[PDB]
Write a protein that binds this ligand. Sequence first.
Ligand SMILES: O=c1c(O)c(-c2ccc(O)c(O)c2)oc2cc(O)cc(O)c12
Lengths: 95, 101, 96, 100
Amino acid sequence: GVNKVILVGNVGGDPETRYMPNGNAVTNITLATSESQERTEWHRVVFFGRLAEIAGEYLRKGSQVYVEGSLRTRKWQDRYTTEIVVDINGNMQLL
Amino acid sequence: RGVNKVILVGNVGGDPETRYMPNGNAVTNITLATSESERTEWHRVVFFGRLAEIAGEYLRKGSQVYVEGSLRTRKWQGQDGQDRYTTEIVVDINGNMQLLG
Amino acid sequence: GVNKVILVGNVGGDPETRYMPNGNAVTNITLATSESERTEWHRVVFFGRLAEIAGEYLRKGSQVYVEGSLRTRKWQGDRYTTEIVVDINGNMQLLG
Amino acid sequence: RGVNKVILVGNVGGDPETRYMPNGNAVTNITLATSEERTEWHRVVFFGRLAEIAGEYLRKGSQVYVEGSLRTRKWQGQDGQDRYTTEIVVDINGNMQLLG
Ligand SMILES: O=c1c(O)c(-c2ccc(O)c(O)c2)oc2cc(O)cc(O)c12
């Protein structure tokens, strides 16, 4: 099928970049979207590949960024987290 | 102030479930599968307003459907006491639904 | 069916804000998106509340997100112009 | 520097015309109808791997999901007068899905 997320919002904190011994950077952020009384929505966005390098270097707290990715719910130690995964199939644009 | 948009095409995982609020407004919950090659991602999709009556009347298990909505993450304490979060795709007047095939 | 366009780019000139016989507000812009150098120019038309805002807050050079629908309009002077219509079914957001 | 995205769900208006460049790579053209009443007709062109698939599995009146980007091409008609044609390009950066 089709699994597509498009966000424009504000980065809630400094990007967390870690490296995989196969070299590849991964970059996690929080991104805030709000609709207007006003209510904010927080999104867990995970960058992979070169976009992770670009993200983990250009983005800061309060950055306005455009993001295009896929929804992925992952199980971990049970807790579930639905992250927006942004890889070569996705896109990002600094605003 | 920003943009919060989800577009899914996939297959309904079970018959829908429609609830009528005391006011008369319908709320229709479904699960929605999307596949990449094979990983299947299961999505929680909730319809409000006019689209909830149409989703409930027309979506059935195995229906192929297009969905446009927004991401909403609901927080709740589990019976163990611990925080939990449930991210849903909300389809309301600002979203869209089309029955496919 | 489904007819959806999402754009992020820069406003080409300044918004041209006219009104209709309704008194409805309409706001035309051109909007440039770049690909990897090559620049695509989009003709974008706002209606209703979003047209008033586009004229109020867009200037030449300002960075915008727009969401709308493709409309191929006909005119004779026999032609065709494809437009991204951004009305109550769409969205716009001032970036930068 | 920007974002240029079109998403459509509709019905192919004709039988896909498939063509082949001197590089052999596939180029297939269709129309696609979207409608609410009002019917909007779209010029969609496929390239690369997705051009090959649009040829075999799309027919007159078939429903399809397409994801691509807008491209307007300029051409002088047989008047010398400028004309424009806006298409939806669906290449390796786009997406397509047969429905049903
Ligand atoms: O009434 C509507 C409306 O307000 C909006 C909307 C959603 C998000 C925005 O950011 C915005 O500016 C407008 O979408 C719609 C989409 C529909 O299919 C039908 C509608 O009636 C609305």
